[PDB]
Subunit: 376 residues, 2 copies
């Protein structure tokens, strides 16, 4: 078989990087009881950089030993790209949401040999599921593999914004002291009203991490959570984001992108919030209106914004979110911590082992299979 795999570029200083440590924690299960991936073997030490071109998701020896062709590239843009040229006879396509090889209806149509579209990481935002259903192909993901990573990144961003960390660090490194400058925008999180948009796997992990900070917790969701969860965390439920925005000091977005959430956080919703509120978005950038976020930070309607997701990705050098006031942005990275990579690379291999051996792929990994959609 031919496996066509798109990954991001190597580190600037070359591969492999100099690792800070030589081992990472062994995670056994996720908070809902789902087990971590269980491939028969892995050809990497967890902690290694796997998601770039030279890292190869740790798959090359495994695939090539079985006789498979493994093409790894970062060149995925346009019809003259390495990806699009190799696509017509690829049996399997693999990519990460951090550097995604889009499977549009048009590309699926010319992928004449395609049977498996495998996300390394979570979700399938870059794949046209309607086209996949009709083409009869399988679309799979390593469910939950980096959800905790994203949750941690979100809470880290919330604390950094509210406490004024980033400008204060700059003062330390630049030779200043200036206590009054540092604390002029520094608040405690304690006692604030904090809400999540959605309480799925990631949203719930965020809510649990926020609880001992003694905030008042809120959420909105299309499908309300069970009473037992709400009682556990002391959650207040809102039917809409607009209702939640009126009462929250901090909102963290953890919802998928679809028509009801596209440009959900525009000027209308932002202006429902109290002047000086905070917004964190580690979900999808298009859930916010890009320019409305700029204007809110320039006016002070938002005291701060942070996230790791951008519209156009990669963010062009001129993206306005880079230097808008009071931001805590990073490039798209949360789900690609070395810890997260170890799990999703292990799961990518687990799924390939099942596929090549004609054994069922875990039901929880399947997004579409043989003309059938798991969700909506």
């Amino acid at each position: 078989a031919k496996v066509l795999c798109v990954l991001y570029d190597d580190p600037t200083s070359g591969y492999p990087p100099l690792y800070a440590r030589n081992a990472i924690p062994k995670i056994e299960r996720y908070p809902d009881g789902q087990t971590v991936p269980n491939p028969k073997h892995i050809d990497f030490v967890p902690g290694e950089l796997l998601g770039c071109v030279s890292g190869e998701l740790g798959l090359r020896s495994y695939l090539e030993d079985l006789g498979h062709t493994f093409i790894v590239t970062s060149d995925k843009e346009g019809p003259n790209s390495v990806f699009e040229k190799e696509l017509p006879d690829a049996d399997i396509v693999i990519s990460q949401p951090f550097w995604p090889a889009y499977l549009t209806a048009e590309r699926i149509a010319k992928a004449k040999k395609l049977k498996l579209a495998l996300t390394a990481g979570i979700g399938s935002d870059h794949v046209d599921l309607n086209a996949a259903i009709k083409a009869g192909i399988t679309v799979a993901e390593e469910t939950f593999s980096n959800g905790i990573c994203v949750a941690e990144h979100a809470v880290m961003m919330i604390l950094a914004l509210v406490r004024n960390y980033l400008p204060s660090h700059k003062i330390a490194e630049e030779g200043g002291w200036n206590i009054a400058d540092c604390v002029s925008r520094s608040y405690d999180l304690e006692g604030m009203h904090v809400g999540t948009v959605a309480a799925g796997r990631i949203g719930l992990a965020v809510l649990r991490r926020l609880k001992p900070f003694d905030v008042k917790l809120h959420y909105t969701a299309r499908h309300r959570s069970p009473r037992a969860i709400e009682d556990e965390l002391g959650l207040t439920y809102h039917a809409t984001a607009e209702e939640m925005a009126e009462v929250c000091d901090v909102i963290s977005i953890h919802a998928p992108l679809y028509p009801a959430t596209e440009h959900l956080f525009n000027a209308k919703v932002l202006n429902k919030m109290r002047h000086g509120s905070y917004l964190v978005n580690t979900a999808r950038a298009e859930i916010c209106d890009r320019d409305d976020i700029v204007r809110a930070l320039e006016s002070g309607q938002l005291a701060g914004y942070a996230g790791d997701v951008w519209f156009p990705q990669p963010a062009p050098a001129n993206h306005p979110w880079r230097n808008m006031p009071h931001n805590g942005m990073t490039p798209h990275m949360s789900g690609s911590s070395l810890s997260g990579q170890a799990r999703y690379a292990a799961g990518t291999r687990e799924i390939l082992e099942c596929w090549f051996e004609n054994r069922p792929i875990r039901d929880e990994y399947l997004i579409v299979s043989n003309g059938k959609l798991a969700g909506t």
Copy 2:
């Protein structure tokens, strides 16, 4: 009476600063059940900048209406300083640990009218308690007033170090993307072994905030915590810091400075840790050996260090902690968040009301009173 109060300098852009918001959460009590301060009135809106010279801890109208003299200055260094010149006839001296007016034995000796040494904030590190005991003076603090602030700052720093936040933000603001560079040192906190040095008011608050991150929790303390606390959090207790260092990936320091903890974290203890460990110090800088921390980060023995406390404070422009590798420093600021200031300024006023009206100061606020030491 004469009240001599030392505070830090005004914001660079002038006083008052432009506030991000016009209200903050109303905190009613601390986690151990202690109530927040209860002065009869305050002359500020909680959220205001109070700890700089123009902020005056909100005390001027109150004091001057009663006929008291209120001298506020930032000039506290040496015998020709404003502080030392006004000291000989001051009845009351007030300062914050963020910009402390040292009451050495020598200064106490020449403070011929001194009766009350009041910390605005917590502790008394800047006061010679032996001299205070013999002089018969009262030393007081607003107990717990900014403990939660420090706890939040510590957890924020832990997450930022482990996930590689600070360098990744720089890449975003500088026009880069470079996913592999960002994640080359980015790990999840989940599953790591994390320990606190001490589990007092602040240490316990840190342990509680860490718990839902699903870390394995450790601590050391001169006085072990009750079994009920250990059972609550799943704590493993160590008799010494050296023992704890051998098993922890991350250590956060929350102990007072005294002979057993001075230079506790030197090369000997640091080398007991696994290569690539993390250390956070929001307690006292002298608990670490300054140059040993540098060397550990240069060798990689530590993957990261962060804190807001420095030896010499203010840190000179040439302090090696400012630009040592992989640091997350801020100036000394955690306990002076606007939220913390609202509580300690309210408590400073509560104590002064008690003092001037000949009513008892809360027992929990007293460090020494009439020749008697509360602790050791």
